Design a protein around this ligand. Structure first.
Ligand SMILES: *[C@@H]1O[C@H](CO)[C@@H](O)[C@H](O)[C@H]1NC(C)=O
Ligand SMILES: *[C@@H]1O[C@H](CO)[C@@H](O)[C@H](O)[C@H]1NC(C)=O
Ligand SMILES: *[C@@H]1O[C@H](CO)[C@@H](O)[C@H](O)[C@H]1NC(C)=O
Length: 508
């Protein structure tokens, strides 16, 4: 009979709520939403945007194609929000408003206060689907065992059926493999404990991370500039970085010295000839940029490998610099799997492989990427960063009706804003994966915030080992809109194990 099915239906629907079983409790009594909330049994009468829900048993204004006799499971009663068809938008309802057939409702999420520690390293739940709702493959399955033992894992981490787990110490969190090419994978959506890297505290010498084979060469020798560090010469404003605690005048953006930012990349549209975004160069072979530069639906954008070209070692915005710049095509583009623009530019990061490794010159050298430890260390001892670019951010996101785009790579140094100060400043929700930067607007402490290139680099130089580290990727920031506000930058310290898996889908 169905009554025994109903009991189990509830159970299977609440499968992802575990550690507190005062959370599994709160799930099963349907008053809040787990996952796509097919567990929801609450009494929210009202859609997310104000409207009264229609009665499930009504046919005015809308004649439902989902009724209690097609979905006898779902408790399609009165006019309460339910999710009878498993909408990836969660529990919904028909609208009493003749112009809107359906709208999602706004239902409290189950377990909200509960919080997962240590990036899912001790996760033992049964979550078996990534963030895009792509089902996990079993770890057991042929490829993941008898062929992927070379990349070994931590075995305090029990790999069980096809549940999201974090075996390889991934700073992004738990993950699992998915249907497609060999090695394909995704991140799963657990609710991680917010951990502000700036207030971490407790590196010795430099020690390398990926192989000179698949990540390519350059890692061993990153962050040192041919024309500066290697000639032991100092650049015109790096002193502000090392003396970042000193209350200085405010050195405005000026033209960069040649070779000053040799990891600077330009993402460039084939046709029409057009400067699209910025990016940085992290090996002979890989390029780091922001995901909105390739995929951003509100702007009806969706580039592929064949539409674009990078330009490396440029100094002049416009002139073709023939002795100097190498200008490469793309083999593959990797949007970060966690990337999401629907709420607000989360994990707005993208990796790009070059069809052919580029040769380091006086003007082409890779920047270093830091890990958690180092990133934290750097933020503890350094209070300003550097953003270099061709003012593409200002030219992309505002009318720029002012003076025009600069004609040479620009350098500027910007203060790093304290997390809470940055939180209050914006309507948008700054996760621990973002940081703000820019001067705190006084009239003797002015504001020109919207600096750099979209998806370009924000860097810091290490006072421990003299190398330059890339600490965030420029994204859109409120500072492009309102004179008082800050630049927004996507942290990079969590990326090593993701890059790792991306490079592992190769072999040669
Ligand atoms: C919401 O449903 C409950 C349950 O009967 C009722 O008391 C309340 O007045 C209803 N309001 C709307 C807008 O449906
Ligand atoms: C429920 O709606 C379907 C959808 O067309 C309709 O044909 C049917 O008459 C309804 N079910 C029952 C059992 O009356
Ligand atoms: C954008 O275009 C590519 C290539 O045609 C396509 O495969 C992909 O489905 C599109 N992107 C998204 C996010 O749907």
């Amino acid at each position: 009979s169905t009554a025994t099915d109903v009991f189990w239906a509830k159970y299977t629907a609440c499968e992802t709520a575990r550690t507190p079983r005062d959370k599994l409790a709160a799930c099963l009594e349907g008053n809040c939403a787990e996952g796509l909330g097919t567990n929801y049994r609450g009494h929210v009468n009202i859609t997310r945007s104000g409207i009264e829900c229609q009665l499930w048993r009504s046919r005015y204004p809308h004649k439902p194609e989902i009724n209690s006799t097609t979905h006898p499971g779902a408790d399609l009663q009165e006019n309460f929000c339910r999710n009878p068809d498993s909408s990836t938008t969660g529990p919904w309802c028909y609208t009493t408003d003749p112009t809107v057939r359906r709208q999602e409702c706004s239902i409290p999420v189950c377990g909200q206060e509960q919080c997962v520690p240590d990036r899912g390293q001790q996760y033992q739940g049964r979550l078996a689907v990534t963030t895009h709702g792509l089902p996990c493959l079993a770890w057991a399955s042929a490829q993941a065992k008898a062929l992927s033992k070379h990349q070994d894992f931590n075995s305090a981490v029990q790999l069980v059926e096809n549940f999201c787990r974090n075996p390889d110490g991934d700073e992004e969190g738990v993950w699992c493999y998915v249907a497609g090419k060999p090695g394909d994978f995704g991140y799963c959506d657990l609710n991680y404990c917010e951990e502000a890297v700036e207030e971490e505290t407790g590196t010795s010498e430099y020690q390398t991370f990926f192989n000179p084979r698949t990540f390519g060469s350059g890692e061993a020798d990153c962050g040192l500039r041919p024309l500066f560090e290697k000639k032991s010469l100092e650049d015109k404003t790096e002193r502000e970085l090392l003396e970042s605690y000193i209350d200085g005048r405010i050195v405005e953006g000026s033209d960069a010295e040649i070779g000053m930012s040799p990891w600077q990349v330009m993402l460039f549209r084939k046709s029409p000839q057009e400067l699209l975004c910025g990016a940085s160069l992290i090996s002979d072979r890989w390029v780091l940029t922001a995901a909105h530069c390739l995929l951003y639906p509100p702007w009806d954008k969706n580039f592929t490998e064949n539409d674009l070209l990078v330009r490396i070692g440029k100094h002049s915005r416009t002139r073709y610099e023939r002795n100097i710049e190498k200008i490469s095509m793309l083999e593959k583009i990797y949007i970060h799997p966690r990337y999401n623009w629907r709420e607000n530019l989360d994990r707005d990061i993208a990796l790009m492989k070059l069809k052919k490794p580029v040769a380091f010159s006086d003007y082409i050298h890779p920047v270093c990427l830091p890990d958690r430890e180092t990133a934290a260390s750097l933020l503890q001892a350094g209070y300003k960063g550097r953003v270099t670019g061709w003012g593409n951010l200002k030219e992309t996101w505002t009318a720029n009706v002012g003076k025009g785009q600069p004609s040479v790579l620009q350098v500027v140094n910007l203060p790093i804003v304290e997390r809470p100060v940055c939180k209050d400043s914006t309507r948008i929700r700054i996760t621990d994966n973002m940081f703000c930067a820019g001067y705190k607007p006084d009239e003797g402490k002015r504001g020109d915030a919207c600096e750099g290139d979209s998806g370009g680099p924000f860097v810091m130089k290490s006072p421990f080992n003299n190398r330059w580290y890339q600490m965030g990727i420029v994204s859109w920031g409120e500072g492009c809109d309102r004179d008082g506000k800050y630049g927004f930058y996507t942290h990079v310290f969590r990326l090593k194990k993701w890059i790792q898996k991306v490079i592992d889908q190769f072999g040669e």
